[PDB]
Amino acid sequence: GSSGSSGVIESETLIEDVLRPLEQALEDCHGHTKKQVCDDISRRLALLREQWAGGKLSIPVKKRMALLVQELLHHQWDAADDIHRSLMVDHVTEVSQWMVGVKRLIAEKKSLSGPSSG
């Protein structure tokens, strides 16, 4: 068998910690990607933050995000999508309403690096 059974209820990660990067990317795109495409993403960000700060996001929905972020930082886009996928599995709706934006960001940020498309 396996029987997962895992829980964690502690203070960790910060909105400005998951946004710092997510935001650092935008600016990058802002000066690369179309103003429309970038505008779209940004718009999504505003939500992410709102939903994040607001508290509409789950604790395990943040700890998971940071992951994708941490990766995007190391350029581990492959990972970003990975974690992003895991989130799209359960917390698909949660991430939704903005996720779409990130989904794009990743690709974008990735492209910037050099390679594009998985």
Short mmCIF file of C-alpha atoms in Angstrom, two decimals:
data_model
loop_
_atom_site.label_atom_id
_atom_site.label_comp_id
_atom_site.label_asym_id
_atom_site.label_seq_id
_atom_site.Cartn_x
_atom_site.Cartn_y
_atom_site.Cartn_z
CA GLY A 1 0.00 0.00 0.00
CA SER A 2 0.98 3.62 0.54
CA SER A 3 -1.49 5.50 2.70
CA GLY A 4 -0.24 9.05 2.30
CA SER A 5 -1.77 10.88 5.23
CA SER A 6 0.21 14.10 5.48
CA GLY A 7 -0.60 17.39 7.16
CA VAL A 8 1.20 20.57 8.15
CA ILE A 9 -0.06 23.63 9.98
CA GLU A 10 2.78 26.07 10.54
CA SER A 11 3.81 29.58 9.56
CA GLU A 12 6.05 29.55 6.51
CA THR A 13 6.64 31.33 3.22
CA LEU A 14 5.42 34.85 2.55
CA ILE A 15 3.18 36.37 -0.09
CA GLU A 16 5.92 38.87 -0.88
CA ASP A 17 8.19 35.85 -1.10
CA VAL A 18 6.12 34.12 -3.76
CA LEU A 19 5.27 37.42 -5.41
CA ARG A 20 8.77 38.86 -5.28
CA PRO A 21 9.76 36.39 -8.01
CA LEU A 22 6.43 36.02 -9.77
CA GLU A 23 6.65 39.80 -10.00
CA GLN A 24 10.33 39.92 -10.89
CA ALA A 25 9.35 37.85 -13.90
CA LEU A 26 6.58 40.12 -15.12
CA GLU A 27 8.88 43.12 -15.24
CA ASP A 28 11.17 40.92 -17.30
CA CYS A 29 8.37 40.05 -19.68
CA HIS A 30 7.11 43.61 -19.57
CA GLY A 31 10.39 44.40 -21.28
CA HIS A 32 10.15 41.57 -23.78
CA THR A 33 6.72 40.02 -24.13
CA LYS A 34 3.88 41.94 -25.74
CA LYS A 35 2.25 44.60 -23.60
CA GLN A 36 -1.03 42.77 -24.08
CA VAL A 37 0.23 39.33 -23.12
CA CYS A 38 2.21 40.84 -20.26
CA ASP A 39 -0.79 42.94 -19.31
CA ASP A 40 -2.83 39.76 -19.13
CA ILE A 41 -0.35 38.04 -16.85
CA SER A 42 0.00 41.06 -14.60
CA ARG A 43 -3.77 41.30 -14.28
CA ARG A 44 -3.67 37.70 -13.12
CA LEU A 45 -0.94 38.51 -10.63
CA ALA A 46 -3.04 41.20 -8.99
CA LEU A 47 -5.53 38.42 -8.37
CA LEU A 48 -2.95 35.94 -7.14
CA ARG A 49 -1.84 38.47 -4.55
CA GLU A 50 -5.40 39.44 -3.69
CA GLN A 51 -6.44 35.81 -3.42
CA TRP A 52 -3.19 35.06 -1.64
CA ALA A 53 -3.38 37.91 0.84
CA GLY A 54 -7.16 37.82 0.98
CA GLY A 55 -6.76 34.28 2.27
CA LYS A 56 -8.72 32.58 -0.49
CA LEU A 57 -5.69 30.39 -1.09
CA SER A 58 -4.94 27.27 0.92
CA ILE A 59 -1.86 26.81 3.06
CA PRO A 60 -0.81 23.80 0.96
CA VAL A 61 -1.59 25.93 -2.07
CA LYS A 62 1.14 28.38 -1.14
CA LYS A 63 3.83 25.99 0.02
CA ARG A 64 3.28 24.29 -3.32
CA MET A 65 3.54 27.51 -5.30
CA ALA A 66 6.85 28.55 -3.78
CA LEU A 67 8.11 25.28 -5.21
CA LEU A 68 7.30 26.19 -8.79
CA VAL A 69 8.71 29.61 -8.00
CA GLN A 70 11.94 28.37 -6.46
CA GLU A 71 12.35 26.42 -9.68
CA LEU A 72 11.56 29.33 -11.97
CA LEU A 73 14.33 31.03 -10.03
CA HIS A 74 16.83 28.30 -10.80
CA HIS A 75 15.39 28.34 -14.30
CA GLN A 76 13.96 24.91 -13.56
CA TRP A 77 10.98 25.59 -15.79
CA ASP A 78 10.58 21.85 -16.24
CA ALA A 79 10.03 21.73 -12.50
CA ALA A 80 7.87 24.83 -12.38
CA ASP A 81 5.43 23.10 -14.70
CA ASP A 82 5.82 19.98 -12.59
CA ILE A 83 4.73 21.64 -9.36
CA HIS A 84 2.31 23.72 -11.40
CA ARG A 85 0.78 20.48 -12.63
CA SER A 86 0.48 18.98 -9.17
CA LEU A 87 -1.42 22.12 -8.25
CA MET A 88 -3.57 21.89 -11.36
CA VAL A 89 -4.43 18.40 -10.16
CA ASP A 90 -6.11 19.23 -6.87
CA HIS A 91 -5.87 22.99 -6.43
CA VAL A 92 -6.85 23.55 -10.04
CA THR A 93 -9.60 26.04 -9.30
CA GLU A 94 -7.72 27.75 -6.50
CA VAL A 95 -4.82 28.53 -8.80
CA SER A 96 -7.35 29.28 -11.51
CA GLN A 97 -8.58 32.82 -12.04
CA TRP A 98 -4.92 33.74 -12.28
CA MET A 99 -2.98 30.52 -12.76
CA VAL A 100 -3.53 30.88 -16.49
CA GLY A 101 -1.34 33.96 -16.21
CA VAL A 102 1.46 32.10 -14.47
CA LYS A 103 1.16 29.18 -16.85
CA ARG A 104 2.09 31.72 -19.50
CA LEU A 105 4.72 33.50 -17.44
CA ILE A 106 6.62 30.25 -17.05
CA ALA A 107 6.77 29.66 -20.79
CA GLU A 108 7.72 33.29 -21.24
CA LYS A 109 10.42 33.36 -18.59
CA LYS A 110 11.60 30.06 -20.01
CA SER A 111 11.73 31.40 -23.54
CA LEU A 112 13.72 34.39 -22.35
CA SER A 113 16.30 31.99 -20.97
CA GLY A 114 16.87 30.41 -24.37
CA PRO A 115 14.86 27.25 -25.07
CA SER A 116 11.11 27.30 -25.56
CA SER A 117 8.33 24.75 -25.25
CA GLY A 118 8.88 21.53 -23.33
#
